[PDB]
Amino acid sequence: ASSVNELENWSKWMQPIPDSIPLARISIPGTADSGTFKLQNPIKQVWGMTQEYDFRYQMDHGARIFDIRGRLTDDNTIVLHHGPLYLYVTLHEFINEAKQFLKDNPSETIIMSLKKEYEDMKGAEDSFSSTFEKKYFVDPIFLKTEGNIKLGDARGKIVLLKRYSGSNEPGGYNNFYWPDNETFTTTVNQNANVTVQDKYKVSYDEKVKSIKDTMDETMNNSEDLNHLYINFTSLSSGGTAWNSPYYYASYINPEIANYIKQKNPARVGWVIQDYINEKWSPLLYQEVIRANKSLI
């Protein structure tokens, strides 16, 4: 759809973007540990909590990528975890919300990253991979087509990004290398190339630099469609003493928002952040969305 004024609607901003653009090229905001918005326990928040509002709030705020880490339970279901902490949220809960939103705004899609956060409970019937694929992935909202997935094929569906290895069912982005606390580049599907900046638990300076460096690489390689650029703005650390993901995000979000705001880039990549809200001054997510005007 024409008109750039349509990227300002946070619920339907993916409508104006042509059905032809591979999802890879689109600058899309996301959320890290999207299911940590339920922890209201103090000592749990300074460590675990990275979000303050529900999936629907996150989605209504332009986010279209979710960082979902779960665990296989005794009752043979997948629930959301953060290391050893149960998040009082489930996979079914995420999927329902994703469907409702996708039902109110069919011109959109949602990429769901699925990572096996904690070890299966001692008593599970099946494996983490099979449990998800046989009781969940088999649901019709999930796009089962692979390759460099375009926007047209994904509208109304849920695109999956496999962070688990034991997969057996076709669909979404296959599982790739992904090293611990690093910045790297591998190959995804047949064509798709991928660069990921996931330096969680690092110094404020080293972090901020990395976000910018990878962000610089992407805005320079803006016309490369067969290249996924994932940029995590999240800085996990042994908080408590104002080292919490809330403190870091309190600075990183506005800062990075401005970095894009002043550079007027054509592409920024997939920017996964913490504390998506209306608190911080420039708004990281709103800027990331605007950097797509080069597609309208």
Side-chain angles (χ1 to χ4, degrees):
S2 60
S3 193
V4 110
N5 75 345
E6 294 157 17
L7 295 175
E8 303 305 309
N9 193 346
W10 298 338
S11 291
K12 324 200 91 299
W13 73 263
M14 267 182 155
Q15 186 175 78
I17 313 173
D19 312 273
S20 39
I21 297 105
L23 288 178
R25 168 70 177 73
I26 308 175
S27 300
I28 310 154
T31 52
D33 284 272
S34 327
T36 54
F37 62 73
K38 278 208 190 97
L39 296 174
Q40 62 175 279
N41 318 144
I43 306 184
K44 290 187 181 175
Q45 301 168 299
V46 289
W47 294 86
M49 209 187 209
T50 76
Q51 294 297 338
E52 53 186 319
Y53 299 116
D54 60 45
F55 299 121
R56 187 55 195 239
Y57 177 102
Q58 309 182 11
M59 286 171 217
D60 282 320
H61 279 48
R64 304 294 185 248
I65 305 167
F66 299 79
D67 185 31
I68 306 307
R69 18 276 305 252
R71 185 195 195 197
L72 214 198
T73 57
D74 253 28
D75 314 327
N76 283 261
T77 61
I78 295 172
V79 294
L80 308 197
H81 253 53
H82 179 87
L85 291 185
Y86 172 42
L87 296 173
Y88 291 60
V89 187
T90 68
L91 228 195
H92 280 129
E93 178 167 12
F94 172 70
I95 306 171
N96 292 324
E97 300 300 307
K99 295 188 186 186
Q100 241 57 265
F101 169 79
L102 245 21
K103 186 261 180 287
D104 300 337
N105 313 287
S107 63
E108 316 296 281
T109 183
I110 93 96
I111 294 79
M112 177 188 100
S113 169
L114 202 254
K115 158 134 184 298
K116 55 289 194 68
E117 183 74 340
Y118 205 50
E119 192 55 73
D120 302 339
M121 286 195 75
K122 38 286 178 182
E125 266 285 294
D126 216 309
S127 66
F128 182 95
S129 68
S130 299
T131 299
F132 170 69
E133 302 189 333
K134 297 187 290 188
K135 299 189 67 175
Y136 302 85
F137 191 42
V138 75
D139 195 308
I141 19 72
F142 290 111
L143 211 208
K144 308 292 191 312
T145 284
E146 299 174 325
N148 210 192
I149 312 163
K150 316 299 180 180
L151 177 64
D153 326 308
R155 321 187 86 124
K157 295 189 166 185
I158 293 186
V159 189
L160 165 78
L161 189 150
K162 313 182 195 306
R163 295 275 300 262
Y164 56 95
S165 66
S167 177
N168 245 297
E169 220 56 53
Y173 299 105
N174 297 285
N175 177 53
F176 49 82
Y177 187 40
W178 207 303
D180 190 72
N181 196 357
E182 206 168 285
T183 302
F184 55 95
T185 174
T186 353
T187 173
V188 197
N189 266 86
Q190 257 227 352
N191 348 77
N193 207 112
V194 67
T195 291
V196 178
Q197 184 280 291
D198 187 37
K199 221 129 67 170
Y200 67 96
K201 177 51 240 177
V202 113
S203 78
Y204 179 82
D205 307 306
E206 178 178 359
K207 184 66 183 184
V208 179
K209 180 174 172 296
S210 317
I211 302 178
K212 290 173 187 303
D213 284 351
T214 301
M215 183 135 38
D216 274 324
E217 182 188 316
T218 160
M219 52 173 91
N220 290 325
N221 200 22
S222 57
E223 282 296 325
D224 193 359
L225 318 162
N226 299 117
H227 205 119
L228 291 174
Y229 284 109
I230 292 173
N231 218 303
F232 282 92
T233 79
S234 48
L235 233 198
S236 63
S237 274
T240 315
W242 264 139
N243 175 21
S244 63
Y246 191 70
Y247 191 65
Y248 287 141
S250 186
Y251 292 98
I252 297 182
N253 290 338
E255 229 266 291
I256 310 299
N258 225 247
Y259 189 68
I260 301 175
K261 199 168 189 176
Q262 193 50 246
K263 291 264 182 177
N264 211 54
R267 168 152 103 132
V268 179
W270 294 0
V271 187
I272 288 60
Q273 72 195 85
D274 276 5
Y275 295 86
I276 180 174
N277 59 29
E278 288 182 5
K279 293 180 179 181
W280 319 139
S281 40
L283 295 193
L284 211 217
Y285 61 89
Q286 181 190 13
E287 288 310 306
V288 173
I289 299 170
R290 281 161 166 171
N292 289 296
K293 47 180 163 48
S294 62
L295 285 319
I296 306 178

